[PDB]
């Protein structure tokens, strides 16, 4: 879930890349507040302080040209010790590694999963789901997380 | 139904006092007579009398001092729902000893002031001041 | 709800004399006779709940009187319930 996800990505990319940091994930939730959650990483490291910097920057540079501001707040984050992940290249870094997935397809042989990444296709994640193996499209998934082994 | 003939006379005393009545009256009973006697003996009333054979009536002549009722508080601690007993020393003080408690001892009813110096605990009827 | 004459027969049976009414014996007897009679009413008039509210009052009143007499004198109680066949 996001507004104008590419526009948002580029408006966020400008302070992220000005700081030399890297984007990972963008996600929004709608509820008691409605709020935007940014996953950033930099392999030298992301401290709380690096989040503080990029967050004060986006809190200005997005707000002043917001396409929407309903109930709004945001956070910026390191992607966790169990990490959310979003693209073929992400799963490809992590072939052989345990994962959980939830999908836009919602059907028996349940499209809610625990998996170990088997291989990556250009359109799909192939994965050792339930100790079986199966494959799910990058479009037919909707959210995924990696090394859920770490609590 | 009627389940406390003593609280009835005490509430008659209160209600009669508040209604400014010169006297109030009750179906008499031996215990009520003894009670009326001890509170006359502590001066809380003008007088009491009983009238009539067979069915009896006990009349209490309510005391008013200058512009006001003499008794200002009267309440009964031995609910028939739960009775109350105290040792010779545990006899309570009413208004820090200004007032009176009524004690039925195994040597009769009397004030707490009498009962403590008589050395008898007993059942406690009520407080008055 | 009883004729004066059925009442007279009952009180002249169970009562001390014609001056007695409402000795426990008189009461429980005439009350019993009424209860017996009303079985004929309700055997037709099943739905007469407002009437049977009185019947429930009567049978419980009978029970209360009997139990008082039972603790007051077992002889009067036993010969009375014998005469009426009560605790049937």
């Amino acid at each position: 879930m996001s507004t104008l996800e590419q526009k948002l990505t580029e408006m966020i990319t400008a302070p992220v890349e000005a700081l030399g940091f890297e984007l990972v994930g963008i996600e929004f939730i709608r509820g008691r507040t409605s709020t935007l959650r940014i996953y950033i990483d930099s392999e030298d490291g992301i401290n709380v302080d690096d989040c503080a910097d990029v967050s004060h920057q986006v809190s200005a540079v997005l707000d002043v040209e917001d396409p929407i501001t309903v109930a709004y707040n945001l956070e910026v984050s390191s992607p966790g010790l169990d990490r959310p992940l979003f693209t073929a290249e992400h799963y490809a870094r992590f072939v052989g590694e345990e994962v959980t997935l939830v999908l836009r397809m919602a059907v028996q042989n349940r499209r809610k999963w625990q998996g170990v990444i088997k291989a990556v296709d250009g359109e799909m994640i192939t994965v050792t789901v339930e100790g079986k193996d199966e494959v799910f499209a990058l479009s037919n998934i909707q959210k995924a997380n990696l090394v859920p082994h770490f609590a | 139904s009627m389940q406390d003939p003593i609280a009835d006379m005490l509430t008659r005393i209160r209600n009669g006092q508040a209604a400014n009545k010169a006297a109030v009256t009750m179906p008499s009973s031996k215990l009520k007579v003894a009670i009326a006697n001890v509170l006359k003996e502590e001066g809380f009333i003008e007088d009491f009398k009983v009238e009539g054979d067979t069915k009896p009536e006990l009349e209490l002549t309510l005391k008013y001092f200058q512009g006001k009722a003499v008794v200002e508080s009267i309440q009964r601690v031995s609910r028939p729902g739960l009775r109350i007993y105290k040792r010779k020393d545990e006899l309570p003080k009413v208004m820090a000893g200004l007032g009176i408690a009524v004690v039925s001892t195994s040597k009769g009813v009397m004030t707490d002031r009498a009962a403590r110096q008589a050395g008898l605990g007993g059942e406690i009827i009520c407080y008055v001041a | 709800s009883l004729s004066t004459e059925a009442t007279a027969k009952i009180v002249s049976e169970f009562g001390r004399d014609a001056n007695d009414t409402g000795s426990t014996e008189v009461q429980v007897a005439l009350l019993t006779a009424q209860i017996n009679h009303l079985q004929g009413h309700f055997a037709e008039h099943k739905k007469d709940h407002h009437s049977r509210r009185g019947l429930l009052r009567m049978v419980s009143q009978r029970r209360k009187l009997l139990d008082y007499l039972k603790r007051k004198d077992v002889a009067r109680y036993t010969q009375l319930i014998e005469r009426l066949g009560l605790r049937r």
């Binding site: 996001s2 507004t3 104008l4 709608r30 396409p67 836009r104 | - | -």
Partner: protein, 252 residues
Amino acid sequence: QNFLNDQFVIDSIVSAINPQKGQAMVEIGPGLAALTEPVGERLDQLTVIELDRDLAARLQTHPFLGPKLTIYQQDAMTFNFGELAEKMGQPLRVFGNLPYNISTPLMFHLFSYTDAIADMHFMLQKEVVNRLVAGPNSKAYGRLSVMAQYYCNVIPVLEVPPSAFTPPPKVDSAVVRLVPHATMPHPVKDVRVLSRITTEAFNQRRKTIRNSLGNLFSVEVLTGMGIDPAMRAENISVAQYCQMANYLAENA
């Protein structure tokens, strides 16, 4: 009347629709530009009906959209979707948002085109959607949900808070998708028999079906079908309802 307001759920709906060429797509009720634009964008070209001719002018004159869609300006319940399925080369994807008094009619008109429609994708109010997908043994079940589940497989897509709408209602609402069965899992001799069986039953839903469908069939017919006539109308699956419909039709 309502149309959506917030980009997050607009984007969620248009992305969940997955609108691309290789699909015979047609909007109905394009409404506010904000939610018709992303679907008219992702489809290289798109068909649409708007009921309103003034809004149809607003959108047809919009150069994002008029050059990028083919546009129709009429009550969709007049509209010959069976010919549009021929003109679009394959059975249609029909989708959008509306004031929805028309909703009950929409479903019947869509079902008049179960051959000509590949799928339907629409926003609707919470109670009618939960009814439409309701399991046979629930108070949410009943005649319209029976007919819907007869015609199509039915699938909730996502659910939306009331503050999301331009005039925000009091009422939460969900987008739902549904699929005319490629072959009917419940083959039926006629649908009018279903429609009247279900209305008789649900017009009498508190009493036993002996005192509902047994006003027409016998108890020995019902138990002969394997159905206990002592059940209530809301115990009964669409399977035995279509079995009753076939029994009515073939024994008449």
